[PDB]
Scaffold this active site. Sequence first.
Site, PDB file in Angstrom:
ATOM      1  CD  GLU A   4      -3.442   0.243   0.910  1.00 26.39           C
ATOM      2  OE1 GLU A   4      -3.931   1.003   1.908  1.00 26.39           O
ATOM      3  OE2 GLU A   4      -3.882   0.535  -0.254  1.00 26.39           O
TER       4      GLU A   4
ATOM      5  CD  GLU B  85      -1.054  -7.850  -5.755  1.00 31.08           C
ATOM      6  OE1 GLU B  85      -1.902  -6.997  -6.207  1.00 31.08           O
ATOM      7  OE2 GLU B  85      -1.081  -7.447  -4.322  1.00 31.08           O
TER       8      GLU B  85
END
EC number: 3.2.1.4
Length: 331
Positions: free
Chosen positions: A131, A271
């Site tokens: 994040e 990812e």
Amino acid sequence: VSFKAGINLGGWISQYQVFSKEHFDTFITEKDIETIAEAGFDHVRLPFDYPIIESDDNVGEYKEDGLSYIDRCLEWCKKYNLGLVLDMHHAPGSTLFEDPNQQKRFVDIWRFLAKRYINEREHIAFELLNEVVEPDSTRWNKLMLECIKAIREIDSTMWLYIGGNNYNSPDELKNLADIDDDYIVYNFHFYNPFFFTHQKAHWSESAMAYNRTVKYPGQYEGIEEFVKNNPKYSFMMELNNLKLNKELLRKDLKPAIEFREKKKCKLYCGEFGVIAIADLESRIKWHEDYISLLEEYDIGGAVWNYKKMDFEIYNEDRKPVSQELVNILAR
């Protein structure tokens, strides 16, 4: 133990709907790690959110019940010879880069984990923070450097996976502070072209507004007509008639390659993936083209996601959505 062809276990102890022991105990079980191991993957990436380890009411007291999930996952991986990239998804506070206190908790959680797993030398790597969305990288660089330092005090050789600003964008690696350290792997996420990989993503306002099925290879359709109707997404005009192909993917990957050319470092794509509602032929082809690029540039990575989370590779019965897709992903 290698960290080249992995898969993510999102939705387990991160992005879990409800904080329930039933979920935590049933979502991922040894049978899943076995399935993954059997399929040929060499490691799993395990995102975790702080609250399952630390509660905001009593900061500094770590939950053994939460930790047991990471401990057991580590045990399962060791049994199947899989690596484990422990990944902090959501950190304390976002106010983290504003509040000194949230930062202290961030480094302490890592300090605690480094000690907790100090004896596991080959099956675990730590990925600091996913994040990160800041105007620039000045504040993340400060915190990241403090975090590396704290960890290094305890464990000089644990591998640390570090990503840049704007959700570990490949073009943000160049903005990270220099880390003279031999045990660092640089991370980046890859979801280009966004409207193909997240077509009709319920959580994307722009994707939900555009609301169009997109094929790959192929091109974006009706962009002009959509902007006309929706002046609020005028920025999308830049994508009008964009051709989606392998050369587009290689272009988007270039920033990471350049960075590596200069830093002579290891890269990792933690990812990458395509929403499960996309047509199967396109979903397969994008992964195939992307994996070929990762193989070409010798970059390891982990596909999003093992099960659920709308990017599923396997159904709940632990059977792959497609065997060709899994074979491709297992490299």
